[PDB]
Amino acid sequence: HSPGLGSDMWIVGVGATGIGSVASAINMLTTILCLRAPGMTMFRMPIFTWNIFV
């Protein structure tokens, strides 16, 4: 129903841009866990970092 070659490029491009999101989530999740300043507990970090955590 969609014989065009553009649709395959769409699929593959979507897939690739989705790898970058997991690649970014991996180190945006473990930076919070591991690398924090002395005194910066989980409940001291700003709302922005909580949102990126979730």
Partner: protein
């Protein structure tokens, strides 16, 4: 990190509860605007989403029980407590960019469905991943 492990139980229990309600409400409710029967897609996905949260939660829980009271987890810590060394962070590398270029080659390989392009892209990706890992290991030139 102690409180990071605990907060995952929230979503875990939530997803686990929904994955039960979904299954039982799809197979035993006739609405008239749908057909009776287990969904089989929203059930697997919700069960395994609970699984993901549980996995991460449990791993962080086991990890946090062997860890000392870290200055970042201490309320009244001084800046001079973490006075030692942090880890080793990569200063620079070209291999991320090339590695992305390699994934972009087998991408087009699969798009056009060219066997040679897929094969080359696969070997190109292996090569770049290998170089990325063996970046800081390349021995001094044995002349």
């Amino acid at each position: 990190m102690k409180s990071s492990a605990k907060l995952m139980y929230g979503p875990t229990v939530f997803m686990a509860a929904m994955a039960v309600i979904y299954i039982f409400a799809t197979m035993h409710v006739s609405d008239g605007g749908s057909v009776k029967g287990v969904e089989w897609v929203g059930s697997v996905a919700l069960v395994l989403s609970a699984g993901l949260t549980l996995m991460l939660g449990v791993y962080l829980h086991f990890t946090e029980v062997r860890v000392d009271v870290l200055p970042e987890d201490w309320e009244e810590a001084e800046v001079a407590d973490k006075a030692g060394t942090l880890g080793f962070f990569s200063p620079s590398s070209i291999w991320p960019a090339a590695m992305s270029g390699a994934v972009g080659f087998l991408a087009f390989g699969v798009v056009y469905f060219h066997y040679w392009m897929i094969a080359v892209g696969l070997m190109l990706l292996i090569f770049t991943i290998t170089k990325l890992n063996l970046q800081y290991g390349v021995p001094k030139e044995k002349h």
